[PDB]
Amino acid sequence: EICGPGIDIRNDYQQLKRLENCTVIEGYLHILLISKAEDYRSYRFPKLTVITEYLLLFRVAGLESLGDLFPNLTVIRGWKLFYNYALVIFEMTNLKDIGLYNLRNITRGAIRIEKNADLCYLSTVDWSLILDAVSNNYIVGNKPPKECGDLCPGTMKPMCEKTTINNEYNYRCWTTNRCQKMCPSTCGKRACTENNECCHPECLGSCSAPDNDTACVACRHYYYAGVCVPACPPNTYRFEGWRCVDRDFCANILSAESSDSEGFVIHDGECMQECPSGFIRNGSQSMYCIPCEGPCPKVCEEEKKTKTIDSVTSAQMLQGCTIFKGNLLINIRRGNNIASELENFMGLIEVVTGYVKIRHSHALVSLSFLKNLRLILGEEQLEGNYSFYVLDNQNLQQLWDWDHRNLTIKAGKMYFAFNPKLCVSEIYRMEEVTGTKGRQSKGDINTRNNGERASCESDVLHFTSTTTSKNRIIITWHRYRPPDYRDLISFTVYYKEAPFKNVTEYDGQDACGSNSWNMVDVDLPPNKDVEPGILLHGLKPWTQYAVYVKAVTLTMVENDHIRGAKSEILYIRTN
Amino acid sequence: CPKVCHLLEGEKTIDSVTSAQELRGCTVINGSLIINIRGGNNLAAELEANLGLIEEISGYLKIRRSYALVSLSFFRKLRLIRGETLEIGNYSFYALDNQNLRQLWDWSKHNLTITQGKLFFHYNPKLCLSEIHKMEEVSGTKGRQERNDIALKTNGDQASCENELLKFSYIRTSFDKILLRWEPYWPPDFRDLLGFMLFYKEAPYQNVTEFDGQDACGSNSWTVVDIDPPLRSNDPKSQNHPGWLMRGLKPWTQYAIFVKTLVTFSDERRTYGAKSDIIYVQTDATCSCPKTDSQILKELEESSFRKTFEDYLHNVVFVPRK
Amino acid sequence: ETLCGAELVDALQFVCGDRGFYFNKPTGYGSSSRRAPQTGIVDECCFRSCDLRRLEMYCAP
Numbered sequence: 001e002i003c004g005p006g007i008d009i010r011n012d013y014q015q016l017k018r019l020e021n022c023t024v025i026e027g028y029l030h031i032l033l034i035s036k037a038e039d040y041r042s043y044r045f046p047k048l049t050v051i052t053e054y055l056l057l058f059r060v061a062g063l064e065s066l067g068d069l070f071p072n073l074t075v076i077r078g079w080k081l082f083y084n085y086a087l088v089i090f091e092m093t094n095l096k097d098i099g100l101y102n103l104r105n106i107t108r109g110a111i112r113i114e115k116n117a118d119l120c121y122l123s124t125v126d127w128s129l130i131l132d133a134v135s136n137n138y139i140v141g142n143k144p145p146k147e148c149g150d151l152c153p154g155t156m157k158p159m160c161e162k163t164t165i166n167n168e169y170n171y172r173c174w175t176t177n178r179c180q181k182m183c184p185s186t187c188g189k190r191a192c193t194e195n196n197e198c199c200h201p202e203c204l205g206s207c208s209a210p211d212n213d214t215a216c217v218a219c220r221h222y223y224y225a226g227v228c229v230p231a232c233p234p235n236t237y238r239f240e241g242w243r244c245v246d247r248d249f250c251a252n253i254l255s256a257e258s259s260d261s262e263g264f265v266i267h268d269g270e271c272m273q274e275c276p277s278g279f280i281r282n283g284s285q286s287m288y289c290i291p292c293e294g295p296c297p298k299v300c301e302e303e304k305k306t307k308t309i310d311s312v313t314s315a316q317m318l319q320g321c322t323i324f325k326g327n328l329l330i331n332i333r334r335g336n337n338i339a340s341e342l343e344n345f346m347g348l349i350e351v352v353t354g355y356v357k358i359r360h361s362h363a364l365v366s367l368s369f370l371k372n373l374r375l376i377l378g379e380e381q382l383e384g385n386y387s388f389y390v391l392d393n394q395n396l397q398q399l400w401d402w403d404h405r406n407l408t409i410k411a412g413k414m415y416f417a418f419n420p421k422l423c424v425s426e427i428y429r430m431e432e433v434t435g436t437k438g439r440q441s442k443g444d445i446n447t448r449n450n451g452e453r454a455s456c457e458s459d460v461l462h463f464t465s466t467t468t469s470k471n472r473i474i475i476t477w478h479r480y481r482p483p484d485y486r487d488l489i490s491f492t493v494y495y496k497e498a499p500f501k502n503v504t505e506y507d508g509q510d511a512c513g514s515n516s517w518n519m520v521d522v523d524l525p526p527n528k529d530v531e532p533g534i535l536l537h538g539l540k541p542w543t544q545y546a547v548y549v550k551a552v553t554l555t556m557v558e559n560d561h562i563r564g565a566k567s568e569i570l571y572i573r574t575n
Numbered sequence: 576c577p578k579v580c581h582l583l584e585g586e587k588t589i590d591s592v593t594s595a596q597e598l599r600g601c602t603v604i605n606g607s608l609i610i611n612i613r614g615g616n617n618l619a620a621e622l623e624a625n626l627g628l629i630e631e632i633s634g635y636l637k638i639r640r641s642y643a644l645v646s647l648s649f650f651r652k653l654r655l656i657r658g659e660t661l662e663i664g665n666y667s668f669y670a671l672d673n674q675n676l677r678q679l680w681d682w683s684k685h686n687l688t689i690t691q692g693k694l695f696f697h698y699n700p701k702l703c704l705s706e707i708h709k710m711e712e713v714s715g716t717k718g719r720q721e722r723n724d725i726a727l728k729t730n731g732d733q734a735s736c737e738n739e740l741l742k743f744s745y746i747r748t749s750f751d752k753i754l755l756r757w758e759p760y761w762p763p764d765f766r767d768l769l770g771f772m773l774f775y776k777e778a779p780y781q782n783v784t785e786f787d788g789q790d791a792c793g794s795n796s797w798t799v800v801d802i803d804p805p806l807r808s809n810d811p812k813s814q815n816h817p818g819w820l821m822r823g824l825k826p827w828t829q830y831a832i833f834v835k836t837l838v839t840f841s842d843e844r845r846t847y848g849a850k851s852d853i854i855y856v857q858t859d860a861t862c863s864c865p866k867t868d869s870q871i872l873k874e875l876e877e878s879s880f881r882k883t884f885e886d887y888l889h890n891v892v893f894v895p896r897k
Numbered sequence: 898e899t900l901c902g903a904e905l906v907d908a909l910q911f912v913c914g915d916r917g918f919y920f921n922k923p924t925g926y927g928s929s930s931r932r933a934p935q936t937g938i939v940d941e942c943c944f945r946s947c948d949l950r951r952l953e954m955y956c957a958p
């Protein structure tokens with residue numbers, strides 16, 4: 001049978017009895033907040049084979065190994081995560097093993113495991129074989145592995161299969177009774193049973209007979225009468241992104257948990273809670289919703305005045321949120337492919353009223369994922385009327401493709417700081433795109449931090465001549481040709497020994513330590529005929545020094561429009 | 576003694592110790608001074624031996640892009656500024672683009688005076704504002720401080736400015752080690768405390784203070800020691816006073832030591848930790864071991880990652896009934 | 898006193914005990930109601946000193 005829409009085991013074991021019959025969990029599954037150990041093994045359910053949304057365990061007691069409870073669970077399609085993960089096992093007091101020997105695939109989301117008491121056998125898993133995008137995992141706050149030994153069948157002739165990952169080749173095994181037996185190479189991506197009998201193409205996890213389409217435990221795309229078809233046939237409709245079910249069923253379900261309207265509604269061959277923006281259930285029907293006649297933006301309210309986005313479920317909440325009428329804050333610490341999911345969740349954001357802050361959004365190197373964001377109303381600003389704030393963000397090599405991207409703020413002045421891989425050139429380009437340059441100050445958009453390590457466009461200064469010595473060099477470079485010679489043109493010669501030509505520019509971080517770009521400032525000579533020169537003395541008769549110069553306008557007022565002149569890095573070997 | 580220093584053009588830029596020797600002995604200045612010292616070795620001691628005799632300035636002082644310079648203590652005997660020669664806008668003290676600037680001379684021992692020029696503080700991301708106000712007070716002319724003279728941003732905004740004081744509840748000096756036990760400082764979010772950073776170094780003269788010497792990097796002056804967070808428990812009164820044992824100290828020797836909280840930055844580094852005072856204590860008479868300070872940063876983003884999860888969990892798990 | 902992390906849950910446990918905690922039962926498929934009629938609870942126990950009164954509001958008799 002199929003449970004749903006979700007199960008929450010809380011404060012009692014007898015509630016586990018809701019898992020006797022139903023083998024599919026058509027929703028999340030929480031198990032948590034119990035204090036007992038006697039009946040730890042009085043319950044177990046060989047029927048469970050598949051989960052869809054995710055799995056969560058917290059403060060659970062008595063349990064020693066999950067495998068004894070779910071001897072047949074194989075797949076987790078991650079239709080909905082918790083924070084950024086499809087499986088969470090947090091602060092468990094007695095879990096000695098993860099079990100789930102038959103767990104053979106995970107579709108979406110990563111795993112997060114930590115604060116557990118006596119849990120090991122997490123590294124022994126070949127997460128790459130069972131989980132794509134293992135990089136987003138978080139498995140560090142658990143018991144050290146050296147303490148238990150994490151052994152498995154093969155203690156006496158290796159029985160558990162063997163694979164290699166991250167330059168380490170060894171066994172792959174969950175338990176001391178069972179191993180992580182992968183499929184052979186003859187079929188690879190395809191599924192397979194024990195004794196290496198590859199299953200049907202569109203199978204997933206495992207099956208009971210090779211090339212069998214109905215003897216399969218799970219389906220890659222969608223279920224139908226148990227027949228694991230990789231495509232929901234017509235006259236049916238997809239549901240929970242994992243089962244192609246009947247039509248009338250979409251009406252028998254209830255939705256008053258969130259919205260007590262006329263059940264769900266059908267669109268794009270799916271029984272959506274409510275079909276996406278720009279559509280209404282004309283006549284209040286669960287089977288059709290034509291496109292709205294007007295703009296019909298799905299407003300997105302605010303539980304708390306500001307909706308801090310630091311997870312993937314926070315974006316799921318904003319899946320169809322096209323016009324977010326609340327203040328917004330980004331605080332993403334990590335994540336690699338999240339940027340693509342945000343193009344499906346947040347890619348439809350067209351207007352963000354209230355302030356828009358970005359603090360430590362390290363995982364975002366380019367804000368282009370907001371492909372539809374065009375107007376930050378900024379009607380409600382932070383201190384200083386900041387309608388666009390960016391503080392202590394990591395690289396963020398780029399914001400958008402200003403060549404085509406249209407961005408325009410209505411009120412409030414922006415702010416940028418500590419973006420080493422973003423040189424203000426793009427910031428000034430944004431200002432020009434928005435016409436807000438007449439609104440900013442000279443301290444807000446600081447060039448001392450934005451672009452510290454950003455090497456981008458700059459003017460050239462051709463070395464006019466050099467003459468080397470056994471221990472010195474007299475080097476004269478060309479005078480700078482700015483639009484205003486009145487500017488306080490002042491050069492700074494950077495230099496350092498370069499035994500190999502794989503040398504780069506100075507990025508501020510190289511102040512102290514070996515291979516630091518040594519710097520020497522010099523003012524342009526008053527004589528307009530003589531060009532700036534320097535005699536340097538830290539040289540070798542045979543060393544290859546990489547050296548160049550950097551010139552800046554240094555306008556009368558602090559940072560009116562600073563256009564930097566960067567010279568090539570020239571390698572010089574004294575006679 | 577009175578040894579004036581008559582200069583050409585009234586403004587001698589000094590970007591090198593070679594330029595410091597030019598004024599070695601120049602106590603009273605006939606003009607102003609401009610500093611752009613970005614890198615070099617033996618800055619502290621050489622500047623003390625050369626410019627230590629500086630009794631007063633007749634002009635003004637400008638300090639632009641002085642990176643390798645950490646503190647101004649090398650202007651020991653400086654007490655007065657005539658403000659006759661002054662930067663554009665009546666600025667006796669002008670400072671700009673001073674990254675490693677950590678602290679000014681002192682505001683309990685060194686007295687200062689300013690005649691005509693104003694102050695200026697911008698892009699000093701490691702210098703707190705408390706010292707700025709202390710200067711505003713001692714130097715006088717506090718009414719000369721106008722708007723934009725000191726932007727609260729880019730002024731010690733990066734270097735954590737400890738706001739609260741810590742107390743050593745219990746101490747024990749031996750001949751080779753020293754046991755310490757201080758108050759269990761615990762912010763509202765106890766988990767925001769990643770640990771403590773004890774700093775210590777021999778100091779026979781109590782005239783030592785913070786930021787007395789530091790190159791572009793500060794892995795040379797102080798001796799740092801990390802201490803894992805304490806053990807929290809219910810009944811907050813029950814948690815033992817966190818402590819630590821410092822090892823390897825010469826018998827019968829005075830060391831200067833102080834605690835420094837290792838905390839986490841909130842949305843606006845609201846969790847300003849604490850620190851105690853420089854404590855002098857004389858001992859009893861009888862493969863790259865040092866860790867990378869950069870690791871600290873790595874310990875931050877991960878910690879804030881865990882707390883961002885729990886706070887989310889409880890934000891959706893529990894439910895209040897009617 | 899303010900409560901955070903594992904200590905908040907330890908106190909909630911000391912409160913409920915054999916009485917058990919109260920959640921929102923999922924009555925129908927799809928999303929659930931507004932995740933909370935207010936902000937998170939830590940906004941009351943971490944940022945503010947929540948007393949036993951607030952702790953009893955989440956329990957189940």
Ligand SMILES: *[C@@H]1O[C@H](CO)[C@@H](O[C@@H]2O[C@H](CO)[C@@H](O[C@@H]3O[C@H](CO)[C@@H](O)[C@H](O)[C@@H]3O)[C@H](O)[C@H]2NC(C)=O)[C@H](O)[C@H]1NC(C)=O
Binds near residue numbers: 105
């Ligand atoms: C566990 O099973 C899943 C079954 O899909 C394996 O696939 C990942 O699933 C996603 C979406 O279901 C696939 O993305 C789809 O691919 C198309 C064509 O490349 C692309 O346009 C979209 O990105 C679309 O979502 C993804 O390809 C698929 N992964 C692979 C390697 O094919 C998953 O790999 C299985 N886990 C393991 C550890 O093998």
Ligand SMILES: *[C@@H]1O[C@H](CO)[C@@H](O[C@@H]2O[C@H](CO)[C@@H](O[C@@H]3O[C@H](CO)[C@@H](O)[C@H](O)[C@@H]3O)[C@H](O)[C@H]2NC(C)=O)[C@H](O)[C@H]1NC(C)=O
Binds near residue numbers: 209212214215
């Ligand atoms: C996987 O292998 C099994 C082998 O058992 C294949 O079984 C065949 O399945 C069909 C329907 O799924 C059975 O038809 C049935 O017909 C019999 C009368 O012959 C009737 O009594 C049943 O109630 C049912 O309607 C067929 O008998 C069965 N054959 C055998 C030998 O079991 C199954 O089709 C394979 N899966 C695939 C091909 O996807």
Ligand SMILES: *[C@@H]1O[C@H](CO)[C@@H](O[C@@H]2O[C@H](CO)[C@@H](O)[C@H](O)[C@H]2NC(C)=O)[C@H](O)[C@H]1NC(C)=O
Binds near residue numbers: 017018019020021
């Ligand atoms: C799991 O299924 C079994 C049978 O399929 C259920 O047992 C039936 O429950 C009714 C309750 O009204 C009893 O009268 C029957 O005697 C039970 N069956 C048998 C064979 O005794 C059981 O209740 C189901 N479990 C759940 C949680 O629904």
Ligand SMILES: *[C@@H]1O[C@H](CO)[C@@H](O)[C@H](O)[C@H]1NC(C)=O
Binds near residue numbers: 384385
């Ligand atoms: C801009 O800032 C000023 C002063 O900080 C204040 O009046 C308000 O925040 C903004 N001005 C408006 C909204 O007119």
Ligand SMILES: *[C@@H]1O[C@H](CO)[C@@H](O)[C@H](O)[C@H]1NC(C)=O
Binds near residue numbers: 403404405406407408
């Ligand atoms: C929108 O962007 C295009 C391409 O960059 C540009 O030609 C056009 O002028 C822009 N219009 C507005 C209103 O920003």
Ligand SMILES: *[C@@H]1O[C@H](CO)[C@@H](O)[C@H](O)[C@H]1NC(C)=O
Binds near residue numbers: 500
């Ligand atoms: C160039 O590469 C070599 C290794 O082949 C390395 O030892 C050296 O440090 C590199 N030089 C620079 C400047 O990165």
Ligand SMILES: *[C@@H]1O[C@H](CO)[C@@H](O)[C@H](O)[C@H]1NC(C)=O
Binds near residue numbers: 574575
């Ligand atoms: C300079 O070095 C080059 C390199 O071989 C040499 O040919 C030349 O004679 C040298 N001249 C002087 C003046 O050192």
Ligand SMILES: *[C@@H]1O[C@H](CO)[C@@H](O)[C@H](O)[C@H]1NC(C)=O
Binds near residue numbers: 581604634660
């Ligand atoms: C320096 O001395 C000259 C006399 O040669 C005098 O005219 C000038 O005012 C003096 N400047 C200062 C700052 O003392």
Ligand SMILES: *[C@@H]1O[C@H](CO)[C@@H](O)[C@H](O)[C@H]1NC(C)=O
Binds near residue numbers: 661662663664666
């Ligand atoms: C100080 O301000 C007065 C008033 O305008 C001005 O005349 C004078 O030139 C200023 N001095 C400096 C050094 O800026």
Ligand SMILES: *[C@@H]1O[C@H](CO)[C@@H](O)[C@H](O)[C@H]1NC(C)=O
Binds near residue numbers: 623780
């Ligand atoms: C302390 O006094 C000694 C002796 O005069 C001196 O060399 C040193 O620079 C002083 N340091 C401080 C910080 O006062």
